[PDB]
Amino acid sequence: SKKNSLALSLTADQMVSALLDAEPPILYSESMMGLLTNLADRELVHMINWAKRVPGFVDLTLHDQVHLLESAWLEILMIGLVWRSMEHPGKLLFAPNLLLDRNEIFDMLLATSSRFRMMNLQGEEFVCLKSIILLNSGVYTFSTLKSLEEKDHIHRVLDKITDTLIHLMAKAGLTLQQQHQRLAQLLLILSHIRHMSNKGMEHLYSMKSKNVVPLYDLLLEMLDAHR
Amino acid sequence: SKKNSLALSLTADQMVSALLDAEPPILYSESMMGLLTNLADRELVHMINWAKRVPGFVDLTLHDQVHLLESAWLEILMIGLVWRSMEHPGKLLFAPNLLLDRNEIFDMLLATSSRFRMMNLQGEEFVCLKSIILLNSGVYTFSTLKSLEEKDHIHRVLDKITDTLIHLMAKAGLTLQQQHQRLAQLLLILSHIRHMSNKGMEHLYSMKSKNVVPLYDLLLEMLDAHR
Ligand SMILES: C[C@]12CC[C@@H]3c4ccc(O)cc4CC[C@H]3[C@@H]1CC[C@@]2(O)C#Cc1cc(CN(CC(=O)O)CC(=O)O)nc(CN(CC(=O)O)CC(=O)O)c1
Numbered sequence: 086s087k088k089n090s091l092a093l094s095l096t097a098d099q100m101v102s103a104l105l106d107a108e109p110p111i112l113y114s115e116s117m118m119g120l121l122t123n124l125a126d127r128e129l130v131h132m133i134n135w136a137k138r139v140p141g142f143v144d145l146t147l148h149d150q151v152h153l154l155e156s157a158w159l160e161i162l163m164i165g166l167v168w169r170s171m172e173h174p175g176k177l178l179f180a181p182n183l184l185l186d187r188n189e190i191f192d193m194l195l196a197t198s199s200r201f202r203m204m205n206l207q208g209e210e211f212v213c214l215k216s217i218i219l220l221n222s223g224v225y226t227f228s229t230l231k232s233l234e235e236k237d238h239i240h241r242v243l244d245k246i247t248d249t250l251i252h253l254m255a256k257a258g259l260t261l262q263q264q265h266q267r268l269a270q271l272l273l274i275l276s277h278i279r280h281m282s283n284k285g286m287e288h289l290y291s292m293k294s295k296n297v298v299p300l301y302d303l304l305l306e307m308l309d310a311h312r
Numbered sequence: 313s314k315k316n317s318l319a320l321s322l323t324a325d326q327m328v329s330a331l332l333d334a335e336p337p338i339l340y341s342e343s344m345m346g347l348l349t350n351l352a353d354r355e356l357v358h359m360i361n362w363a364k365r366v367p368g369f370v371d372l373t374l375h376d377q378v379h380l381l382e383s384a385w386l387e388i389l390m391i392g393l394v395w396r397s398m399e400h401p402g403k404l405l406f407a408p409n410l411l412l413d414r415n416e417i418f419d420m421l422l423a424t425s426s427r428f429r430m431m432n433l434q435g436e437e438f439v440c441l442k443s444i445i446l447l448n449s450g451v452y453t454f455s456t457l458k459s460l461e462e463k464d465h466i467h468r469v470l471d472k473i474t475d476t477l478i479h480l481m482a483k484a485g486l487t488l489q490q491q492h493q494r495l496a497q498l499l500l501i502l503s504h505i506r507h508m509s510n511k512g513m514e515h516l517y518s519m520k521s522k523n524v525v526p527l528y529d530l531l532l533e534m535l536d537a538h539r
Pocket residue numbers: 117118121122124125128162163165166179189190191192284285286288289290
């Protein structure tokens with residue numbers, strides 16, 4: 086209701102449950118780039134559905150919902166990957182039947198996955214991060230009274246997810262200090278994910294340009310939204 | 313000493329003073345792109361000097377020092393600008409004698425400046441942010457025992473700057489909660505600055521490619537480091 090919003094009245098545990106229930110279905114893959122863009126294409130359908138279930142999200146205009154999707158899709162895909170590969174050091178689990186390794190975007194992705202493991206990132210935190218990406222990546226790329234009213238909403242939901250995260254950390258045995266150091270640690274990693282997304286976008290765009298065959302519709306649509 | 317490091321033994325106020333003393337000299341400008349790349353070129357000299365004085369920085373290898381500079385230079389330039397223009401709504405103060413306005417990278421830069429104003433960002437916080445950019449932007453783009461020892465250092469200094477920031481906020485009248493919400497707010501903005509840096513880099517590169525005249529040496533060197 087963007088004023089009576091259900092998202093602002095959710096406790097930290099409620100928020101966490103909602104996010105966990107919203108988690109998309111495990112997908113499997115069906116050349117190497119072709120397997121990746123196929124998976125990517127199919128995950129995007131499920132991510133559009135996932136976003137609906139993210140507290141605060143349906144309270145924005147449809148155009149703003151689409152803008153956030155267009156802005157954050159790769160980062161979201163990437164944080165998923167980085168997360169799946171957390172336990173496979175030197176490897177990238179794109180799907181259970183698609184695991185690759187060591188021996189550069191892929192290297193940045195491996196490092197990030199390592200960083201997560203060394204921090205021992207938790208599934209409850211993961212889902213928090215993924216939503217922040219959704220709500221934040223587009224936000225300074227939307228002017229008007231409605232525009233700032235939308236921005237103010239997103240900022241309010243983001244503050245709400247911060248509280249959750251902080252709550253989670255406190256629930257586990259962590260000093261106030263340790264809480265704000267881990268919060269900082271995790272958010273700074275999203276800088277790197279933005280960066281990787283910008284590089285992956287450039288890469289994907291190259292392949293499009295040098296391939297003759299246009300690749301999947303949805304995936305192409307989310308790529309074209311950038312530029 | 314990266315073990316006896318002076319940076320890890322600095323209190324929050326000490327850290328803040330050091331950062332403030334390290335602040336570079338006000339520069340003035342001397343076509344529009346030519347004025348901007350000139351200023352940019354001249355600021356870079358002073359930023360190399362500024363970095364030396366950033367606690368923790370001289371404790372890294374020289375190659376890692378250069379890598380961090382090459383990685384973070386535009387973001388740092390941009391956070392400077394965004395900060396200078398905070399008080400000139402709809403305008404960008406590149407230098408006191410170079411002020412531009414409204415009527416897109418520049419728009420992202422204005423929005424960020426607005427965001428800062430609405431948050432009423434403080435000079436003590438500004439300098440904290442600028443250093444985090446320095447220490448963080450390159451860090452997941454450095455493998456070996458020394459490599460992780462460097463990473464562990466940077467992470468330790470970053471944790472130290474988090475404490476400072478949090479301290480500052482507490483010093484001003486802020487709830488624990490307000491502290492972790494503002495910390496989140498500020499770090500998420502660095503995602504956007506990374507993003508803008510990636511876009512500005514692409515832009516700068518275009519101008520280089522379509523201009524015949526090569527522009528300034530230092531500036532060209534920091535651009536070439538990307539790619
Ligand atoms: C967008 C993206 C494709 C889709 C990716 C994706 C999909 C789903 C998902 O859930 C998460 C993510 C996360 C990352 C997403 C990719 C990042 C950029 C992309 O376009 C690519 C790649 C790609 C792939 C391969 C696979 N490669 C495997 C192999 O050679 O068999 C096939 C390819 O060379 O054709 N190589 C490179 C470049 N390669 C550089 C090179 O080898 O010199 C990176 C490297 O392998 O380390 C880039």
